[PDB]
Design a protein around this motif. Structure first.
Motif, PDB file in Angstrom:
ATOM      1  N   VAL A 107       0.863  -1.182   0.000  1.00  0.00           N
ATOM      2  CA  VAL A 107       0.000   0.000   0.000  1.00  0.00           C
ATOM      3  C   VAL A 107       0.912   1.249   0.000  1.00  0.00           C
ATOM      4  CG1 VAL A 107      -1.816   1.262   1.235  1.00  0.00           C
ATOM      5  CG2 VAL A 107      -1.849  -1.230   1.212  1.00  0.00           C
ATOM      6  N   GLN A 108       0.532   2.284  -0.746  1.00  0.00           N
ATOM      7  CA  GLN A 108       1.344   3.495  -0.816  1.00  0.00           C
ATOM      8  C   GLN A 108       1.288   4.301   0.475  1.00  0.00           C
ATOM      9  OE1 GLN A 108       1.006   5.947  -4.461  1.00  0.00           O
ATOM     10  NE2 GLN A 108       1.949   7.666  -3.364  1.00  0.00           N
ATOM     11  N   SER A 109       2.438   4.424   1.130  1.00  0.00           N
ATOM     12  CA  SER A 109       2.574   5.174   2.376  1.00  0.00           C
ATOM     13  C   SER A 109       2.791   6.647   2.038  1.00  0.00           C
ATOM     14  CB  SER A 109       3.766   4.641   3.179  1.00  0.00           C
ATOM     15  OG  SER A 109       4.939   4.643   2.382  1.00  0.00           O
ATOM     16  N   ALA A 110       2.505   7.525   2.992  1.00  0.00           N
ATOM     17  CA  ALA A 110       2.647   8.962   2.773  1.00  0.00           C
ATOM     18  C   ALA A 110       4.080   9.427   2.541  1.00  0.00           C
ATOM     19  CB  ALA A 110       2.034   9.732   3.932  1.00  0.00           C
ATOM     20  N   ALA A 111       4.917   9.298   3.565  1.00  0.00           N
ATOM     21  CA  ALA A 111       6.300   9.755   3.483  1.00  0.00           C
ATOM     22  C   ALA A 111       7.197   9.066   2.465  1.00  0.00           C
ATOM     23  CB  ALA A 111       6.955   9.712   4.865  1.00  0.00           C
ATOM     24  N   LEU A 112       7.212   7.737   2.477  1.00  0.00           N
ATOM     25  CA  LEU A 112       8.090   6.994   1.582  1.00  0.00           C
ATOM     26  C   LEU A 112       7.452   6.474   0.294  1.00  0.00           C
ATOM     27  CD1 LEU A 112      10.235   5.249   4.324  1.00  0.00           C
ATOM     28  CD2 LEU A 112      10.687   7.370   3.099  1.00  0.00           C
ATOM     29  N   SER A 113       6.216   6.904   0.035  1.00  0.00           N
ATOM     30  CA  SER A 113       5.469   6.532  -1.171  1.00  0.00           C
ATOM     31  C   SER A 113       5.429   5.044  -1.508  1.00  0.00           C
ATOM     32  CB  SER A 113       5.979   7.324  -2.379  1.00  0.00           C
ATOM     33  OG  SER A 113       5.726   8.711  -2.219  1.00  0.00           O
ATOM     34  N   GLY A 114       5.386   4.212  -0.472  1.00  0.00           N
ATOM     35  CA  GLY A 114       5.324   2.778  -0.685  1.00  0.00           C
ATOM     36  C   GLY A 114       6.641   2.033  -0.811  1.00  0.00           C
ATOM     37  N   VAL A 115       7.775   2.734  -0.759  1.00  0.00           N
ATOM     38  CA  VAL A 115       9.063   2.047  -0.854  1.00  0.00           C
ATOM     39  C   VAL A 115       9.286   1.209   0.414  1.00  0.00           C
ATOM     40  CG1 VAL A 115      11.552   2.259  -1.126  1.00  0.00           C
ATOM     41  CG2 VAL A 115      10.021   3.742  -2.420  1.00  0.00           C
ATOM     42  N   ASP A 116       8.877   1.739   1.566  1.00  0.00           N
ATOM     43  CA  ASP A 116       8.988   0.982   2.806  1.00  0.00           C
ATOM     44  C   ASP A 116       8.065  -0.244   2.726  1.00  0.00           C
ATOM     45  OD1 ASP A 116       6.756   2.724   2.846  1.00  0.00           O
ATOM     46  OD2 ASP A 116       7.134   3.447   4.883  1.00  0.00           O
ATOM     47  N   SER A 117       6.852  -0.052   2.197  1.00  0.00           N
ATOM     48  CA  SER A 117       5.884  -1.143   2.041  1.00  0.00           C
ATOM     49  C   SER A 117       6.469  -2.216   1.121  1.00  0.00           C
ATOM     50  CB  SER A 117       4.581  -0.619   1.422  1.00  0.00           C
ATOM     51  OG  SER A 117       4.121   0.546   2.085  1.00  0.00           O
ATOM     52  N   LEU A 118       7.036  -1.778   0.000  1.00  0.00           N
ATOM     53  CA  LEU A 118       7.639  -2.688  -0.975  1.00  0.00           C
ATOM     54  C   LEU A 118       8.796  -3.502  -0.388  1.00  0.00           C
ATOM     55  CD1 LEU A 118       7.969  -3.791  -3.883  1.00  0.00           C
ATOM     56  CD2 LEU A 118       9.375  -1.764  -4.351  1.00  0.00           C
ATOM     57  N   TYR A 119       9.741  -2.829   0.266  1.00  0.00           N
ATOM     58  CA  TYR A 119      10.893  -3.520   0.847  1.00  0.00           C
ATOM     59  C   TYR A 119      10.508  -4.517   1.937  1.00  0.00           C
ATOM     60  CZ  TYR A 119      14.307  -0.411  -1.510  1.00  0.00           C
ATOM     61  OH  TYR A 119      15.094   0.240  -2.429  1.00  0.00           O
ATOM     62  N   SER A 120       9.560  -4.140   2.793  1.00  0.00           N
ATOM     63  CA  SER A 120       9.116  -5.005   3.888  1.00  0.00           C
ATOM     64  C   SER A 120       8.383  -6.257   3.413  1.00  0.00           C
ATOM     65  CB  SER A 120       8.232  -4.233   4.881  1.00  0.00           C
ATOM     66  OG  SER A 120       8.881  -3.095   5.400  1.00  0.00           O
ATOM     67  N   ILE A 121       7.873  -6.228   2.182  1.00  0.00           N
ATOM     68  CA  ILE A 121       7.152  -7.374   1.640  1.00  0.00           C
ATOM     69  C   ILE A 121       7.978  -8.250   0.698  1.00  0.00           C
ATOM     70  CG2 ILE A 121       5.200  -8.123   0.214  1.00  0.00           C
ATOM     71  CD1 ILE A 121       3.626  -5.730   1.288  1.00  0.00           C
ATOM     72  N   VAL A 122       8.644  -7.629  -0.269  1.00  0.00           N
ATOM     73  CA  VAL A 122       9.406  -8.370  -1.270  1.00  0.00           C
ATOM     74  C   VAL A 122      10.711  -9.030  -0.818  1.00  0.00           C
ATOM     75  CG1 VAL A 122      10.800  -6.495  -2.275  1.00  0.00           C
ATOM     76  CG2 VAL A 122       9.966  -8.362  -3.739  1.00  0.00           C
ATOM     77  N   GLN A 123      11.383  -8.435   0.164  1.00  0.00           N
ATOM     78  CA  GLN A 123      12.670  -8.948   0.631  1.00  0.00           C
ATOM     79  C   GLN A 123      12.667 -10.149   1.579  1.00  0.00           C
ATOM     80  OE1 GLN A 123      16.133  -7.165  -0.624  1.00  0.00           O
ATOM     81  NE2 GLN A 123      14.439  -7.872  -1.929  1.00  0.00           N
ATOM     82  N   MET A 124      11.641 -10.990   1.494  1.00  0.00           N
ATOM     83  CA  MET A 124      11.544 -12.173   2.354  1.00  0.00           C
ATOM     84  C   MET A 124      12.735 -13.119   2.143  1.00  0.00           C
ATOM     85  SD  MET A 124       8.916 -11.921   4.402  1.00  0.00           S
ATOM     86  CE  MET A 124       8.528 -13.651   4.887  1.00  0.00           C
ATOM     87  N   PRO A 125      13.215 -13.758   3.227  1.00  0.00           N
ATOM     88  CA  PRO A 125      14.351 -14.687   3.180  1.00  0.00           C
ATOM     89  C   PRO A 125      13.998 -16.059   2.616  1.00  0.00           C
ATOM     90  CG  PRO A 125      13.412 -14.778   5.332  1.00  0.00           C
ATOM     91  CD  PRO A 125      12.681 -13.657   4.600  1.00  0.00           C
ATOM     92  N   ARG A 126      15.029 -16.801   2.227  1.00  0.00           N
ATOM     93  CA  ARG A 126      14.869 -18.139   1.666  1.00  0.00           C
ATOM     94  C   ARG A 126      14.045 -19.052   2.578  1.00  0.00           C
ATOM     95  NH1 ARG A 126      17.763 -23.011   1.986  1.00  0.00           N
ATOM     96  NH2 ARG A 126      17.860 -24.264   0.064  1.00  0.00           N
ATOM     97  N   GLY A 127      12.983 -19.631   2.025  1.00  0.00           N
ATOM     98  CA  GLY A 127      12.141 -20.534   2.789  1.00  0.00           C
ATOM     99  C   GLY A 127      10.710 -20.084   2.989  1.00  0.00           C
ATOM    100  N   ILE A 128      10.494 -18.766   3.007  1.00  0.00           N
ATOM    101  CA  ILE A 128       9.162 -18.202   3.214  1.00  0.00           C
ATOM    102  C   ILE A 128       8.873 -17.145   2.146  1.00  0.00           C
ATOM    103  CG2 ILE A 128       7.610 -17.092   4.873  1.00  0.00           C
ATOM    104  CD1 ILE A 128      10.932 -18.520   6.066  1.00  0.00           C
ATOM    105  N   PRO A 129       8.352 -17.567   0.985  1.00  0.00           N
ATOM    106  CA  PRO A 129       8.048 -16.629  -0.101  1.00  0.00           C
ATOM    107  C   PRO A 129       6.726 -15.869  -0.035  1.00  0.00           C
ATOM    108  CG  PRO A 129       7.451 -18.797  -0.781  1.00  0.00           C
ATOM    109  CD  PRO A 129       8.165 -18.964   0.538  1.00  0.00           C
ATOM    110  N   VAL A 130       6.722 -14.700  -0.671  1.00  0.00           N
ATOM    111  CA  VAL A 130       5.532 -13.867  -0.823  1.00  0.00           C
ATOM    112  C   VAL A 130       5.659 -13.281  -2.239  1.00  0.00           C
ATOM    113  CG1 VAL A 130       4.283 -11.760  -0.194  1.00  0.00           C
ATOM    114  CG2 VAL A 130       5.217 -13.211   1.616  1.00  0.00           C
ATOM    115  N   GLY A 131       4.727 -13.641  -3.125  1.00  0.00           N
ATOM    116  CA  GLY A 131       4.740 -13.122  -4.485  1.00  0.00           C
ATOM    117  C   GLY A 131       4.228 -11.699  -4.406  1.00  0.00           C
ATOM    118  N   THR A 132       5.103 -10.734  -4.671  1.00  0.00           N
ATOM    119  CA  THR A 132       4.764  -9.317  -4.558  1.00  0.00           C
ATOM    120  C   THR A 132       4.317  -8.625  -5.853  1.00  0.00           C
ATOM    121  OG1 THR A 132       6.419  -9.280  -2.782  1.00  0.00           O
ATOM    122  CG2 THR A 132       5.569  -7.153  -3.516  1.00  0.00           C
TER     123      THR A 132
END
Lengths: 162, 162, 162, 162, 162, 162, 162, 162
Positions: F87-112
């Motif tokens: 979801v698009q955040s105010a200050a960081l325009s969704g970059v924080d949202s993107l990084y917190s979701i897509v950067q999952m470690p090996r073993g637990i995937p989330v298709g972003t």
């Protein structure tokens, strides 16, 4: 005699650079203002920088946005100190302006100030501080102005409603 | 007659720009190579750009890093098409180089390529494609080169060990 | 005969790309305009690029935002020079558009212009400069247009109120 | 009499700031060097800034990395011009250093130079240019040094192997 | 019968994508591996995507770096689910790869995984989870594998030396 | 029977996630919608994920902004495929949202998917494509919908005014 | 009795978090160390946080990299103060770690420290300062340690060679 | 007796910091509020920090934007725990504020919260949690407040219109 020149890449930059001129009005510092475009008037840029010392300028404040080449190209053509102000661009919010000005290579410096109006005002204050080193009267006016800003904050410690 | 000129801000830029010259050797395209610094040799930059058309150049490829002003200042002084290559800087990894080149204002364009060696090679390929529009022989050589690259990938579909 | 084609990924891109067409109207350069989507009309993209040379196009200006694949995929299918314009996206302000266009790998170049309307106008100017190499009349019109822009800045050096 | 002081937040910053001192050795400019930490020696920072004018300093060059508070806090305590050098940090490659120094608010300026060694050298050159305004001999040495850098590039136009 | 295909833009991408194939070896999932370049083999990309359903693929994992167009162009040509892996680029450390893949427009999705080797492994795990919905045996193997990873962490709570 | 569940961290996320539900209404795909907060209802998150398989869900679409932990924590508690929408955040325009979701470690995937409304719609389309692998009727509806989008662009090639 | 617990997502995080434990050894502060993974041991995370108050912990220091969910999920399950340390990730150099930890929503705070080893050490110092409010002996040791750091800088003002 | 002090760099920061004071009103926590500028009132900053322990403060919440030096300089002058709130700046949307606060070096910590109003509220909640360790009544009020937030989400699972 105007010892400082305020230049900018376009007339639309005045919305930002007017804050540099405001500091000089407050401090009573004679100054020159002119639009010199690195990309639309490249030859004028060279002639302006080449004659800066002869015209009596001791500090040059240059503002530009986007691929901000104005400050650096002036600095490449004169030994007169150059201060750069990054104008806030639409898409990149001044990051492109900042990088194009601050990242100058060894040999050709540009003292860079903050993005936007705060930087424009600060470039004028820095120019004033430079001049103040050999101008006792201006040094006193800068001192009084700084005290006035400090006192305003000190006499109003509570930000809440009355 | 050399119809393309490859220029760069410093000799250290050659580690990157040599990849542009490599494409021209492969395609048999006559070219000029020279170090022209926007900040250390500003006057040479102006004389180089002013005489570009008379010297027979139809495309100019310019590479620079950091506060990369070279491509844009050349473009401001000539109507000969200018292609810019952002050299990878240490601290900002070429983002400063990229912003200083690609963000040119309306009226003075610079066709920008990728950061680094890939961009240098591509600037040469783009220059070649531009020339190829009026050079049937070069157009054929570009075609054969592209086919060769495609075929290499097609005849090697499995990336695993033999 | 139209020697340049302006293509874009969606009709909403016209708010940006109309500035490329404006330059051509001013310079009297015949041009084609069409919506070709890399993602919604992939087959049309291939047919458009494959027939570009036969249709007489010497330069292709392609605009797209977000995951901007249009310019690069066209460039992969034709030897006609491709210029890319990054449309400003909402969330990432065109940085995604810029990266997806400028970072092309060795072998398939796309000359990239600034983010937004400035880039659209510049892509047209660059295309015009390319054509001007073999069109004396267009070269003269470009020259006169550039002089007109320079003169406007020169005859209005003071940005302050009258 | 030393008219310029070079200060830094930690001794490890010397790997960067030594390049500022190098410029002064070349130009024969007397200078003071000292480690003043905004966070580990806050009281020393205040005493250093308060006595700067009395100690004869006309320019202060301050270097720091990460949450680089040194330049700004010195500037808040004296009217002597302050130039800031962002030291390259590990994780953020100096972007944190750059933002913490350049983004100063209206009233307290810090003329900022490039990230790293190039910025350190440039801060010294800028300080020299400031001093040169009232020092004819130094102005001449700066002029000769600049000419020497330009000539080196001019007498070596071809970057390729001999 | 191979229900999943692992494709990549270049053979150098195998250093990253091999980690996707590793998950399939561990889970005993038949898979196809092939180099399909969006820019060097555009026609092969179209033929691969068009025949994916007929070839029995239910999930396609595509990896690419820089201006990573491969995943999106495949997704534009088939209804078979596409998972994208951003390969880490040199200059932009995979941010360009990430933006070019994840920012797809409404209508053509690409499920994106983390930058690099972690993302390659996760794309395979996600593909496995998708298949596991209608494959009880595979679902059990995934369950056992997950338990094994959890247990390893649980039986080693103290990270300090023995 | 609802084979897909759309979850979000807060009710304010509905302004974005409603676009995922819209795709399902168009395609006639039964779905569940619910607010599950990773930070305000952590226990509910665990119970929701643990019972997902038993409740018949084959795909879970999870949306969140800022420190977006919802998608990843659900994925850590179930083998049912999880798709994440930043979801698009105010200050960081969704970059924080993107990084917190897509950067999952090996073993637990989330298709972003993409940041914002485009990503919400695409997460639903991807879920539909996954279901369509074993649902001929849904596969046909997806096909017809895609054709409809393509045709709209094809029958309107000129973006200019009538 | 250990009043502070140091937890991390993986054993590889110890290379960073060991610097937090070092501060406690120096200050003689009893502490617990354990690997608790938000993604590989989600149930253990919940049990650890739920029993933190009963186990006597007054401060919890949690370190994680990439999609760093550990600190926030612990904070969502207990009222014991949580301090987060962003571990430096390969591709994004800890920016993903930083955003995933610091951007917590209203209601569930996590006091975040610098990226890497400096942050690990500082998280321990902050925890110590918190404990020191009700521990006169520890307060004295912190005071002496700070004085020792200041004195080291004060007795070594010249960074140049002897 | 006020055990917590909320300070900010300017009165305009109150639009953000008022959300910290709101949490204290809700939780019935006595607090002090004051404007202390690192750059406009540097001496007041030192006197405020030096007397913090004697004035009874156990936690200090400091907010600032841009080159946000306030939190760090206070932390350098006292052992009382300092929590920092990055105010959202215009041009850089709080990234400069965030970097200037969170990147503190080893020895002088500042527990940093989210950018903006969410961070202000969370800094107060964290301060409350710290106090709650030795205040059973406050601990209970925090518990009840958290339950109230959770219940609100639990009793409203469907975000769609009634």
């Amino acid at each position: 005699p105007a010892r400082v020149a305020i230049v900018m890449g376009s007339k639309s930059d005045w919305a930002t650079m007017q804050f540099a001129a405001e500091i000089f009005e407050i401090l009573n510092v004679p100054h020159h203002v002119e639009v010199v475009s690195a990309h639309r008037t490249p030859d004028k840029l060279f002639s302006f920088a080449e004659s800066a010392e002869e015209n009596g300028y001791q500090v040059i404040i240059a503002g530009a946005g986007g691929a901000a080449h104005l400050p650096g190209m002036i600095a490449a053509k004169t030994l007169v100190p150059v201060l750069g102000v990054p104008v806030q661009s639409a898409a990149l919010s001044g990051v492109d302006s900042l990088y194009s000005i601050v990242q100058m290579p060894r040999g050709i410096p540009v003292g860079t100030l903050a993005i936007g109006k705060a930087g424009a005002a600060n470039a004028a204050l820095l120019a004033a501080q430079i001049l103040a080193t050999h101008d006792k009267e201006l040094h006193q006016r800068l001192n009084d102005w700084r005290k006035a800003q400090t006192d305003e904050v000190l006499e109003n410690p509570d930000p809440r409603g009355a």
